[PDB]
Design a protein around this ligand. Structure first.
Ligand code: WN8
Length: 340
């Protein structure tokens, strides 16, 4: 087998000429030459079977992506694993090879307004399909947004995804969470489990702001710092939005803070398109029930050059609802279609 960085990357013989690209959750990511389709591809190695949690993350991603088909969602081309459950230690996911990701792009490249507009449209177009399947991505961030050489965008990593469950979304104050800090909606710190579609819209809002200035808009330095940054820009919540927070510990925390004024978007982003800032404001709305939804965002005047509901498809079969040995067995079963 082809050793890579002192680790087994055993994808032969179809996939050869392997170059390191990055890291997934449970293994590295490599480029490789697909000797059948005569194209270079990306391959993610996964080693999850010793842990129930890693098996869950792997299973849900495979189950979702094997049913999803959308231009702005990177699909699974192939899955490589041993022929038997006894022998399967690793799983390799083969996907399209893209040129870069938005995280890497934002470190060095200033985006034109036309690029920001096209990138945002594709994110929302992909998100519309996802949400139409009753699925939440729940970890949208620049590093999960891939771009090819012609700036086509695809959404990656559904390992943190969940089926939407808005009736069971309420929880207590400062309860644990998994998604990436800087892209976490304020209600996550206050009273939400992240089971509603609005947590994804907040992340997209954070991404739009970051495309406008090449820096994260809410760079919280630890779990507790995140809410400081959000309120530092949005200002103090209104009485109406506080009344919507019925949990007493969360509401009383917000009531204990001194007044903060809203920072105008056009002062944070003096070069930004005014229509972009209007949409930004609607995505970064404090109250999730007032936060703009994906289909409304697509119809915003900022995206008028691209908006076409007949060219923004939705899922055929939405998802109705949601030991490691049983999970390995289900991963084996779910990947069987890619064997001879
Ligand atoms: C396999 C897929 C996993 C996506 C999810 C993921 O792990 C993230 O950490 C993301 O940051 C990927 C790092 C490198 O991911 C690529 C880089 C690149 O230059 C071209 C690509 O096609 C990919 C890719 O396909 O990533």
């Amino acid at each position: 087998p082809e050793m890579v960085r002192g680790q087994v990357f055993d994808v032969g013989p179809r996939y050869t000429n392997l170059s390191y690209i990055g890291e997934g959750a449970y293994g590295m990511v490599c480029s490789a030459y697909d000797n059948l389709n005569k194209v270079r591809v990306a391959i993610k190695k996964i080693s999850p079977f010793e842990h129930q949690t890693y098996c869950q993350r792997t299973l849900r991603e495979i189950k979702i992506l094997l049913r999803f088909r959308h231009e702005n969602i990177i699909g699974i081309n192939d899955i490589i694993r041993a022929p038997t459950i006894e022998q399967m230690k690793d799983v390799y996911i083969v996907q399209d090879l893209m040129e870069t990701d938005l995280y890497k792009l934002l470190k060095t490249q200033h985006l034109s307004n036309d690029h920001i507009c096209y990138f945002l449209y594709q994110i929302l177009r992909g998100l519309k399909y996802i949400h139409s399947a009753n699925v939440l991505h729940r970890d949208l961030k620049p590093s999960n947004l891939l771009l090819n050489t012609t700036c086509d965008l695809k959404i990656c990593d559904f390992g943190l995804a969940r089926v939407a469950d808005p009736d069971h979304d309420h929880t207590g104050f400062l309860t644990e969470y998994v998604a990436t800090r800087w892209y976490r909606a304020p209600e996550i710190m206050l009273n939400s489990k992240g089971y509603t579609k609005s947590i994804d819209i907040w992340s997209v809002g954070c991404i739009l702001a970051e495309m406008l200035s090449n820096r994260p808009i809410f760079p919280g330095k630890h779990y507790l710092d995140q809410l400081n940054h959000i309120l530092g820009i949005l200002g103090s919540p209104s009485q109406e939005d506080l009344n919507c927070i019925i949990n007493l510990k969360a509401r009383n925390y917000l009531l204990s803070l001194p007044h903060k004024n809203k920072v105008p978007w056009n002062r944070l982003f003096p070069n930004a398109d005014s229509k972009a800032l209007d949409l930004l404001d609607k995505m970064l709305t404090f109250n999730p029930h007032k936060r703009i939804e994906v289909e409304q965002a697509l119809a915003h005047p900022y995206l008028e050059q691209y908006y076409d509901p007949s060219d923004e498809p939705i899922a055929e079969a939405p998802f109705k609802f949601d030991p490691k040995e049983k999970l390995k067995e289900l991963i084996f079963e779910e990947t069987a279609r890619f064997q001879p």
